[PDB]
RNA sequence: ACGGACCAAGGAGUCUAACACGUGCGCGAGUCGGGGGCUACGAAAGCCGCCGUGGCGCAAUGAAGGUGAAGGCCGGCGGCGCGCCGCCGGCCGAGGUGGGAUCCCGAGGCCUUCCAGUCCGCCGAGGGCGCACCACCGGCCCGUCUCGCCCGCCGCGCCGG
RNA sequence: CCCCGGCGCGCCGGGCCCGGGUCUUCCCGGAGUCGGGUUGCUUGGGAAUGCAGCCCAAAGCGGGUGGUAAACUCCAUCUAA
RNA sequence: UCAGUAACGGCGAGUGAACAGGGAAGAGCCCAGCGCCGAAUCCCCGCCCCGCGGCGGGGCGCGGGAAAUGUGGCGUACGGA
C-alpha cells in the first residue's frame, strides 16, 4: 500500500537472500595477505621488479575510451620481430608476450618498437655463472648498482602534446563545420541509394540507346 | 577546401596509416590441399555416393535446378550448403557426361 | 540511536501509534506494487504518469559506450584551458588565438549558451552545434573537426 | 460480552536494502575513496591525485534516425514591390510589469541668555535601485502541425541549413 | 640444547652432442561432428541464449560469430567437434 | 562500476545480465593428424654395486611380453619440416 507521493520501486528481496550475504569483514586481513604475498613475492625475485615484466602502450577500444591510453597483456610478434627479440628469449628476460594481438597502425607499432629498445637499454643482464660472464652481459659496476623499482616499470602516462597560438586564417573562418557534419551524415545515409539510382539510370539509357 | 578528419561519414575515423604484415597462419584452415583433395577423391570413388545424393543427381539429369535445390536445402539445411552441394553434384554430372561422351 | 527514536515515546500506549479502531495487521491492502491496475489505480494515475504499457522501440543490445557523447557550452568554455591562455590572448597585439582542445578536456560535442568574450578561438572538438558555431564566428575564432 | 487464583523472572515496531521529506556538518560546480595500493589498542588511523577510473550533479528532448537552450542599432552592396529579404565592417551588448523585507537621496527640525553659525549623530514629507518569492507578459532549445521565401558546395540531390 | 626443510659450496655416477638470420622445396588439422527442422527444460536473450531427445545430415579460398527471420554482396574477427 | 541498465514479463506482480574502464593476480602449453628417422619405445623377471620409512640410478641377460590395428624423438596454428 504506497502512500503520497513517492518513487515506484521494485526491491529484488524475493528470494531467500539470507543465506547468501557475503559480509566483508575479510578485507583488512585479506589486505594484509596481499600485502605479505607480495613482499613475499619481491624478497623471492631479489633484483627483478616486483611488479613484472612490462606492458605495451596500448589503445583503447569501443568509442568512449579510444583517447586513453592502456597496459596490455603482452608484445605482439610482429614488434618483437621488427626489435629483434626473440618470444622465448623475452619470456626469459621479463618481457609480456602474447600472441593473439595484431599490428594494425604503424605509429603504436613504432611506440612499441622503441618502447623495446629504451627496455633493452635500461635492463641489467646478470650473467648465469658469476666467475664466467659471457658475451651479452652486464658490467661490475652496474652489477652492484643493480636494484629493484618499486611500482610499475616504465608507468604509462598519458601525454598530450602542446599546441601553439596559431593566427586564425580565411579558409579557417569559412569553413562551415556543422553544415559539413550534416552533409556527411547525409552522404553516409544515402551511399547505397544514389549508387542504385545511377545503376538504374544506366539501364535506363542502355534501354533508351538499344 | 580543407578536409578535417570527421568522427562520422563517408570515410570516419582517426587518420592512421596501414601496414602491409603477413596474414595470420590461423587464418588458412579448410584450404584445398593437393594431398586432401586426393584422399577426397579417392574416397570419393571407393565409398561412392549417398542416396539423397544420388536421387538430386537424378533431380538434375532431368533437368529440375529448383526442385533439386529445394530438395537438397531440406536434406542439408542452409541455402549456402545447398547451393554449394548443387554445384558439386552439376560439376560431377558433368563430369559423368564427359566421361560417358569421351 | 535507539533512545531517540519513536520506540521510546509509545511505551505505555497500547496500540503503538497505529490505531485503535484499525489493528495494525499484517499486509492491508498486498505486498509491493500490488493491485495497481485495480485497487491503487488512484494513486499510480495522480502520482506515477505512464507507468502501465510500451512505447518506443526495442533495442536489443544497447551500448552505452556507443551511446557516449559529453557535452560542453560555450559559456564555460574556457574553464577547460587555463586562466594565463586567456591573459596572453587579450593581451598579443598580433592576434594569436588560443586553441581550445575540447576532446583532450574530455568531451566530445560543444554547444552554444552563454555569451563569450570578444577574442578569437579554435576550437578543436568531435561535434558542434550550429548555435556554437554562430557564436564562435560572431566573436572570431575557427571550428576544427577531430575524429 | 470476552482474558484474568496469586507472585517472581522472560516477553512484543528491531536489523539490512531502496526511496521521499525535514534537520545538523564539511566542501562547493563540483563532491565522494566506499574497491585497491603505501606506512597491545591497531580489524584502528594516516596517505594516494597520471589510483576521480566510476556514481551523482552541471542539458534537455524525440519512439528513433537525431537535434540541442537572448537580441537590437548604424553604414555599404544585391534582389523584389519609403517598406521587406540576403551578405560584410563598428557600437549597445542579458528581458519587462506589479507587489516586494532591507538599503540610498534628504523639503525641515530636533531647546536653556538673543542672533550669527561649522561638524558628529537622530527622525522624516516625498522620490529611487530594487534580495528572495509570487502572478503575468515576452524570448530561446527540442518533437509535432500549417503557410512560403531564400541561402552553401568536395560530391548540384528524394542534399543540408 | 635437539629435530626438520630451504638458500650455497666441493666431489661422484649419469643423460645431452642441443641455437639464430636469409633463400629454395613441401605440409598443414579433431564427423552422427557442425548445421537445419521439431519437442521439452532453461535463459535478460526477445522469428528460439544454452542443453537434451528424435529425424535429416555436411563442406574445405571451408566452417562458426557479427543480439530481428530471409536472399544477394563486400568486410571484420576466431579455428569448434 | 556498468546497473536495477539493455532486455524478459496475464509488459501485470516481478525478474534481469553482458561489453568496456579501474584494480588483486598474471604463466603458458602438450597431443592426434601431416611427415622424417633399421621400434630408434614401454612393462615385468634373474645377477652385481649404491641406496633402501615417497623401491629409484647404472651395468650384465640368443630372458619373457606389449607395440606396425603404431611406442618414442623433431613438431601444433604464435606456423612447422
Ligand atoms: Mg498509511
Ligand atoms: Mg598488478
Ligand atoms: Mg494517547
Ligand atoms: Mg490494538
Ligand atoms: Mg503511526
Ligand atoms: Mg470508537
Ligand atoms: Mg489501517
Ligand atoms: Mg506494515
Ligand atoms: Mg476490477
Ligand atoms: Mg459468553
Ligand atoms: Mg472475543
Ligand atoms: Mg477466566
Ligand atoms: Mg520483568
Ligand atoms: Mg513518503
Ligand atoms: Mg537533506
Ligand atoms: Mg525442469
Ligand atoms: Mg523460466
Ligand atoms: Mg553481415
Ligand atoms: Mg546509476
Ligand atoms: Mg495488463
Ligand atoms: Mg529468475
Ligand atoms: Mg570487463
Ligand atoms: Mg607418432
Ligand atoms: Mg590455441
Redesign the pocket.
Known amino acids: 500500500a504506497p502512500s503520497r507521493?513517492?518513487?515506484?520501486?521494485?526491491?529484488?528481496?524475493?528470494?531467500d537472500w539470507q543465506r547468501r550475504?557475503a559480509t566483508?569483514?575479510?578485507?583488512?586481513?585479506?589486505?594484509?595477505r596481499?600485502?605479505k604475498?607480495?613482499?613475499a613475492?619481491a624478497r623471492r625475485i631479489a633484483p627483478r621488479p616486483?611488479?613484472?615484466?612490462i606492458?605495451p602502450i596500448?589503445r583503447?577500444?569501443?568509442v568512449?575510451?579510444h583517447t586513453?591510453?592502456?597496459?596490455?597483456?603482452?608484445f605482439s610478434?610482429?614488434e618483437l620481430?621488427v626489435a629483434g627479440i626473440?618470444?622465448?628469449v623475452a619470456?626469459t628476460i621479463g618481457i609480456?608476450?602474447?600472441?593473439?594481438?595484431?599490428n594494425?597502425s604503424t605509429e603504436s607499432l613504432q611506440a612499441n618498437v622503441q618502447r623495446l629498445k629504451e627496455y633493452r637499454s635500461k635492463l641489467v643482464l646478470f650473467p648465469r655463472?658469476?666467475?664466467a660472464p659471457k658475451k651479452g652481459d652486464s658490467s661490475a659496476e652496474e652489477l652492484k648498482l643493480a636494484t629493484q623499482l618499486?611500482?610499475?616499470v616504465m608507468?604509462?602516462?598519458?601525454?598530450?602534446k602542446k599546441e601553439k597560438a596559431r593566427v586564425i586564417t580565411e579558409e579557417e573562418?569559412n569553413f562551415?563545420a556543422?553544415?559539413?557534419?550534416?552533409?556527411?551524415?547525409?552522404?553516409?545515409?544515402?551511399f547505397g541509394?544514389?549508387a542504385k539510382?545511377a545503376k538504374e539510370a544506366a539501364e535506363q539509357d542502355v534501354e533508351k540507346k538499344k | 577546401?580543407l578536409?578535417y578528419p570527421?568522427a562520422?561519414?563517408?570515410?570516419k575515423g582517426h587518420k592512421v596509416t596501414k601496414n602491409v604484415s603477413?596474414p595470420?597462419?590461423?587464418?588458412?584452415?579448410?584450404?584445398?590441399?593437393?594431398?586432401?583433395?586426393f584422399?577426397?577423391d579417392m574416397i570419393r570413388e571407393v565409398c561412392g555416393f549417398?542416396?539423397?545424393?544420388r536421387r538430386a543427381m537424378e533431380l538434375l539429369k532431368v533437368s529440375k535446378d529448383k526442385r533439386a535445390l529445394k530438395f537438397i536445402?531440406?536434406?542439408?539445411?542452409?541455402?549456402?550448403?545447398a547451393?554449394?552441394?548443387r554445384e558439386?553434384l552439376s560439376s560431377v554430372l558433368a563430369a559423368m557426361r564427359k566421361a560417358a561422351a569421351k | 540511536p535507539?533512545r531517540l527514536?519513536?520506540?521510546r515515546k509509545?511505551?505505555g500506549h497500547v496500540?503503538?501509534?497505529?490505531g485503535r479502531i484499525g489493528?495494525?495487521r499484517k499486509h492491508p491492502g498486498?505486498?509491493?506494487?500490488?493491485?495497481?491496475?485495480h485497487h491503487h489505480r488512484i494513486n499510480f494515475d495522480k502520482y506515477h504518469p505512464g507507468?502501465?504499457?510500451?512505447?518506443?522501440?526495442?533495442?536489443?543490445?544497447?551500448?552505452?559506450?556507443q551511446?557516449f557523447?559529453?557535452?560542453?557550452?560555450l559559456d564555460?568554455l574556457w574553464?577547460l584551458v587555463s586562466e594565463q591562455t586567456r591573459v596572453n590572448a587579450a593581451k598579443n597585439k598580433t592576434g594569436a588565438a588560443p586553441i581550445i582542445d575540447v576532446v583532450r578536456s574530455?568531451y566530445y560535442?560543444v554547444?552554444?549558451?552563454?555569451?563569450?568574450?570578444?577574442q578569437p578561438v579554435i576550437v578543436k572538438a568531435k561535434?558542434?552545434?550550429?548555435?556554437?558555431?554562430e557564436?564562435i564566428?560572431?566573436?572570431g575564432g575557427a571550428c576544427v573537426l577531430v575524429a
Open positions: 507521493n513517492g518513487m515506484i520501486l521494485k526491491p529484488h528481496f524475493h528470494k550475504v566483508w569483514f575479510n578485507q583488512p586481513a585479506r589486505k594484509i596481499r600485502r604475498a607480495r613482499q613475492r616486483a611488479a613484472g615484466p606492458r596500448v583503447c577500444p569501443t568512449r575510451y586513453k591510453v592502456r597496459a596490455g597483456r603482452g610478434l610482429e620481430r626473440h618470444k622465448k619470456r609480456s608476450v602474447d600472441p593473439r594481438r595484431r594494425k655463472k658469476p666467475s618499486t611500482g610499475p608507468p604509462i602516462r598519458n601525454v598530450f573562418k562551415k556543422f553544415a559539413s557534419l550534416r552533409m556527411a551524415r547525409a552522404n553516409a545515409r544515402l541509394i544514389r539510382r | 577546401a578536409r570527421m562520422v561519414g563517408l570515410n603477413k595470420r597462419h590461423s587464418r588458412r584452415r579448410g584450404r584445398l590441399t593437393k594431398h586432401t583433395k584422399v577426397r549417398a542416396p539423397y545424393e536445402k531440406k536434406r542439408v539445411g542452409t541455402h549456402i550448403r547451393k554449394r552441394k558439386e | 535507539s527514536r519513536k520506540t509509545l511505551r496500540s503503538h501509534g497505529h489493528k495494525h498486498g505486498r509491493g506494487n500490488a493491485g495497481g491496475m507507468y502501465f504499457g510500451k512505447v518506443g522501440m526495442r533495442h536489443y543490445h544497447l551500448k552505452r559506450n551511446s557523447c559529453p557535452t560542453v557550452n564555460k574553464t574530455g560535442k554547444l552554444g549558451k552563454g555569451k563569450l568574450p570578444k561535434f558542434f552545434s550550429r548555435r556554437a558555431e557564436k564566428k560572431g566573436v
